[PDB]
Ligand binder design. Sequence first.
Ligand code: CL
Ligand code: CL
Ligand code: CL
Ligand code: CL
Ligand code: CL
Ligand code: CL
Ligand code: CL
Ligand code: CL
Ligand code: CL
Ligand code: CL
Ligand code: CL
Ligand code: CL
Ligand code: CL
Ligand code: CL
Ligand code: CL
Ligand code: CL
Ligand code: CL
Ligand code: CL
Ligand code: CL
Ligand code: CL
Ligand code: CL
Ligand code: CL
Ligand code: CL
Ligand code: CL
Ligand code: CL
Ligand code: CL
Ligand code: CL
Ligand code: CL
Ligand code: CL
Ligand code: CL
Ligand code: CL
Ligand code: CL
Ligand code: CL
Ligand code: CL
Ligand code: CL
Ligand code: CL
Lengths: 219, 219, 219, 219, 219, 219
Amino acid sequence: PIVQQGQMVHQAISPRTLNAWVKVVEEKAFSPEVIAMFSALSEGATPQDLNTMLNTVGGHQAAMQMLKETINEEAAEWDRLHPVHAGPIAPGQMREPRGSDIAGTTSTLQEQIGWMTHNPPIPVGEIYKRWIILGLNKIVRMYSPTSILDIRQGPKEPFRDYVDRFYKTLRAEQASQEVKNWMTETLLVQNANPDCKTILKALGPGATLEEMMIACQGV
Amino acid sequence: PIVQQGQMVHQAISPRTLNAWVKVVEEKAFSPEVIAMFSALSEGATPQDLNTMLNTVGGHQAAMQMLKETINEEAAEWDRLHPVHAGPIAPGQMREPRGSDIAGTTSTLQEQIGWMTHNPPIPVGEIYKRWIILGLNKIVRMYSPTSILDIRQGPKEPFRDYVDRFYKTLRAEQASQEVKNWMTETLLVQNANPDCKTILKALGPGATLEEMMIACQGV
Amino acid sequence: PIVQQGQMVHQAISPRTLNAWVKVVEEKAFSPEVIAMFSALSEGATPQDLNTMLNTVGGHQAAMQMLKETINEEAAEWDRLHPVHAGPIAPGQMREPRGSDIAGTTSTLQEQIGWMTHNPPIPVGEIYKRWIILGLNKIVRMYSPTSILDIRQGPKEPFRDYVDRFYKTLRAEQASQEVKNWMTETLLVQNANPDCKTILKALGPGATLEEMMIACQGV
Amino acid sequence: PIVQQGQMVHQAISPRTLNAWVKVVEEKAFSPEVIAMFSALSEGATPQDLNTMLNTVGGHQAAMQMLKETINEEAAEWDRLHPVHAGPIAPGQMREPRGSDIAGTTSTLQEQIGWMTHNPPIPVGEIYKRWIILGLNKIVRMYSPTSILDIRQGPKEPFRDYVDRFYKTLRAEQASQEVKNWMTETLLVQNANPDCKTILKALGPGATLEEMMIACQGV
Amino acid sequence: PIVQQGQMVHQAISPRTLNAWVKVVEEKAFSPEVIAMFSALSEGATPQDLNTMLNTVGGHQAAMQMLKETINEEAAEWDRLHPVHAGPIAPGQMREPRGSDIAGTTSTLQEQIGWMTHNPPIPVGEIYKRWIILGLNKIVRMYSPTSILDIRQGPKEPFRDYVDRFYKTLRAEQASQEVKNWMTETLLVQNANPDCKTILKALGPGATLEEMMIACQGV
Amino acid sequence: PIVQQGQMVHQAISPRTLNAWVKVVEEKAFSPEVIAMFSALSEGATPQDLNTMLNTVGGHQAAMQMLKETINEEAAEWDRLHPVHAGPIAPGQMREPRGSDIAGTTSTLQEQIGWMTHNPPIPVGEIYKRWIILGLNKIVRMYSPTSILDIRQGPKEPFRDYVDRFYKTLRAEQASQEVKNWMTETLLVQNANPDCKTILKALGPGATLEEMMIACQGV
Ligand SMILES: [Cl-]
Ligand SMILES: [Cl-]
Ligand SMILES: [Cl-]
Ligand SMILES: [Cl-]
Ligand SMILES: [Cl-]
Ligand SMILES: [Cl-]
Ligand SMILES: [Cl-]
Ligand SMILES: [Cl-]
Ligand SMILES: [Cl-]
Ligand SMILES: [Cl-]
Ligand SMILES: [Cl-]
Ligand SMILES: [Cl-]
Ligand SMILES: [Cl-]
Ligand SMILES: [Cl-]
Ligand SMILES: [Cl-]
Ligand SMILES: [Cl-]
Ligand SMILES: [Cl-]
Ligand SMILES: [Cl-]
Ligand SMILES: [Cl-]
Ligand SMILES: [Cl-]
Ligand SMILES: [Cl-]
Ligand SMILES: [Cl-]
Ligand SMILES: [Cl-]
Ligand SMILES: [Cl-]
Ligand SMILES: [Cl-]
Ligand SMILES: [Cl-]
Ligand SMILES: [Cl-]
Ligand SMILES: [Cl-]
Ligand SMILES: [Cl-]
Ligand SMILES: [Cl-]
Ligand SMILES: [Cl-]
Ligand SMILES: [Cl-]
Ligand SMILES: [Cl-]
Ligand SMILES: [Cl-]
Ligand SMILES: [Cl-]
Ligand SMILES: [Cl-]
């Protein structure tokens, strides 16, 4: 990483950050908290550090390939928007980055260090990290076993376990916040069991989750 | 976090702080010591760091949703009190924060770093942390299985195990210190078994817990 | 904590200090080494840090309540000795602390940081730590199962196991060093078995523990 | 290692970096993620540090010998390109490195520290690290049990497990990116089972992996 | 501890140093390597830190008492040699230490910090550490089960296991290097079995341990 | 140790370096990777630190004695080459070291710190470390169960397991690189089974290990 006397300084990714990242993917495959874990472990990371984390994953090579193809599509999108001009980089400057420079594959650690601390900074680590999170969300979606359309409360299932399953499956749905808003409002109460489904009607369409779970405790 | 040469400096949340936070929620669900643990692990944290801790929680998504709704209500309360004025942020200043900026969702790490160290500081991490603790207390209450009204000493139960159960259940009650004061004074001795319930009367209504447990050791 | 370039600096309590403190109380309840552990883990701690350690204890809430009542009695003793004067705190100064400010309950981290580093320093962490250790000793006493009066050497019990039990029980007795001096001198040899009890007489009343255990090795 | 106030500074390789490296080779023998692990643990390393990691490997001495012979061939290639001139190293300079100086075997830590920080730097750690990775790839190839030519989808094998096996075996193939490109394009779909092999034809020869795995989910 | 910019600085004893020290005494009681461990963990320690390590030992309170009595005897020896003069400590100076000040029992951390860094330094930590090691050696001796006089090679016992037992028992003998020299030279070969006892004679009285163990490999 | 602002600074050996060193010797006795581990853990170490590591070894006291005798022989060799001159050490200088000063036994930490950082430096830690590694190699040799002369490929033994055993036993042989060169060239192919022994002849006497193991894969 790089961490802010106040003069900025470059460290290697620590063994426990790495060991933490690897044990996470061994245990939980790809799920939403894995991505938070990814983002959490990667604070201030250079592309080198990001590639480190991705190459140390053994197994799951279909997912790691999908992620490779995703990164290349964002790189091509970067290239199209940001064309590379001809001519020699004058003394006292640094070259403008390509898509592959941002993905760590055709840049040195110094150039990554150069872009990140320069005024203004081209935040290449943060740009790349987006592309990686993009591709991880695509994977999470694909490997999510169930659709949110199929989360129905069972006859004896206490309401709170039903809400746990609903929102877990919702967390892995790749759809925008307004869609999610609509599924919370439409599907949650729509797919409850007859008993609770009744009990919640009597609160009204704009009641909180805290209000709804207190309603169906006694049920 | 940010930690105080004496010049302030910004670090990433460490892997063990994170690993500690995750293992805590895996093991103990939501109980009062979890919140102390939360507060303890989050010292000096930015909103980014606070969101990190909350998103790495797998499972319990009903609780994490309730917490989401709580945070939005405090944000709306913040917005109403603190309206955002029109006009461009002049050079040498920083914008005044919205509710969503405080919750890390619509601010950068730099802006969070900006507010926290500026003179005077807008302590956004500390404000957000309150809202999160607010919502965690609401959860602890909801998931507490028993009411304090139902903690009765059993015929053979030594007094000290009864006090352990009383104060554990009391710790999860969401009621102010004066109410708690009253429950200690009224209910504790009121719900003891006939034997100890007698033995404590003979001390009087203003005796300490150390005095009461010595009284009922021999019982 | 705060730790001494030489300019003083404020850190958060580390995850392993915390994890160490919690695992200690899970395992060994309240015994004398727990208090050494407490003191050891708390070096340079602010009241915030001290409260952190105490609130992360799950279970044992009778003990944690007793400790609460103890802290309040020392706070009232502090208040009586140190009254708070009327009038506004002039620029370039800091307020004099109340009992509750010392117990971290009605002070900020900055004020605690203020008192500790100021010239002269009001060492609030160290004052509070005393009150906490005070209340922990009261607990250790109460939860000690046996009295020192009841440690008698058994007929086949080698002398060294008897000395181990004597001094362990003595460590949990809440009585001053001169009392302890007297119990070592009177009770140890007085409660040995007939065989060793004899063998030690022949050394005289002012012989060391090293001399006494060599005496009763062959017995 | 050496890690960037901003003045550069030399540290010893930490016990956990070492312990991490050793446990990796105990567990997983030689596979592609081991090399990422190698590269990851070795950031900023001197040749001393690189030799440290290689000598602490117990077992696998055939592989460690092959690696020895590989390093000597790159050293001889270095020597041939970079001949060592006669004459005394003038005051205010440092000698130009031989192949064996780069491999840490005939240089001090100071000389390695000298080359790495000097202006311009001879990056000896990074040069050596290449030679080591070179020899590790040769080992991974040799110890890979299967050829990519033999990865055929089985009749009941869901497509995603087949892709996992394909790309895992591909990761250990020592052939350039254009060859790999060709194997992805030719062999993957060519070696699928009749069912999926059909289903993918109907997308066309230029469809993504995300598109192909969605195609064969329902199969 | 205190550890050497170059300006000296005071740290708390770390949780793992402490946890390491406690686990050592739980596992191995008192043996020679425990003392090396003690010395090793205590580098640069103040008396506070030394007392920390000693009070966190649960169990073994006979040994910890013996150690208490030993420390008091060295303190009285210190007092007799170093009498405390009358009169007020002038501004710009610090008091001369008593025996109890050196044992951490009647001094603050500041005074310990004062003596250690002052010019000239009174190295109180190092003086106390001696007294503690003194008392630990006395304990190791006492708790050593066997005398070196009783280590005889058995008829089938390979020579190297006999040497392992000899020198282990010798390490716990409290006798000076010249005595140890004599026991190596007299007893080792004197207590070997008839076979090896012969075989070594034929080398002569001034042969090394490497020479003697090669001699008795084939036996 | 001592580790390079750029001003040099002295640290204590860390608990995990120590714990790592002790667990290594508990597990693997004395083998070549133990020595790499030794060298690896001891980077920048003073003689104090080196003695720390050696005294914390419990068990194996025959080996630790042999090592003691070895160190004394190198000390006597040092003394003979480097005689100690008469006369008082003038102000602004430091004494020249004896053999026992280098072995940490008759020098302070300050004097060790003095020699190591002075211009020019007498690198006492590095000199001592050599003597210790010298004596460890002598031990490894002695405790190696098998001679390289006895490593013969068995009839069904795949070639690669045979190479693993050959080079493992070779790593523990105490003979120079030219001897080792000769054993690789003469014995390896000379002691293979009839089948492989044939197959390798047909490559010629100057073929690599990578070439030889590919040759005997199909066998
Ligand atoms: Cl820094
Ligand atoms: Cl680390
Ligand atoms: Cl997956
Ligand atoms: Cl890779
Ligand atoms: Cl940009
Ligand atoms: Cl479900
Ligand atoms: Cl800093
Ligand atoms: Cl960490
Ligand atoms: Cl919960
Ligand atoms: Cl998330
Ligand atoms: Cl504010
Ligand atoms: Cl209960
Ligand atoms: Cl600092
Ligand atoms: Cl930590
Ligand atoms: Cl308790
Ligand atoms: Cl709390
Ligand atoms: Cl005061
Ligand atoms: Cl007892
Ligand atoms: Cl530094
Ligand atoms: Cl470390
Ligand atoms: Cl292998
Ligand atoms: Cl080696
Ligand atoms: Cl170069
Ligand atoms: Cl396969
Ligand atoms: Cl410092
Ligand atoms: Cl630590
Ligand atoms: Cl013991
Ligand atoms: Cl104590
Ligand atoms: Cl002195
Ligand atoms: Cl024995
Ligand atoms: Cl430093
Ligand atoms: Cl450490
Ligand atoms: Cl051995
Ligand atoms: Cl020792
Ligand atoms: Cl020299
Ligand atoms: Cl073998």
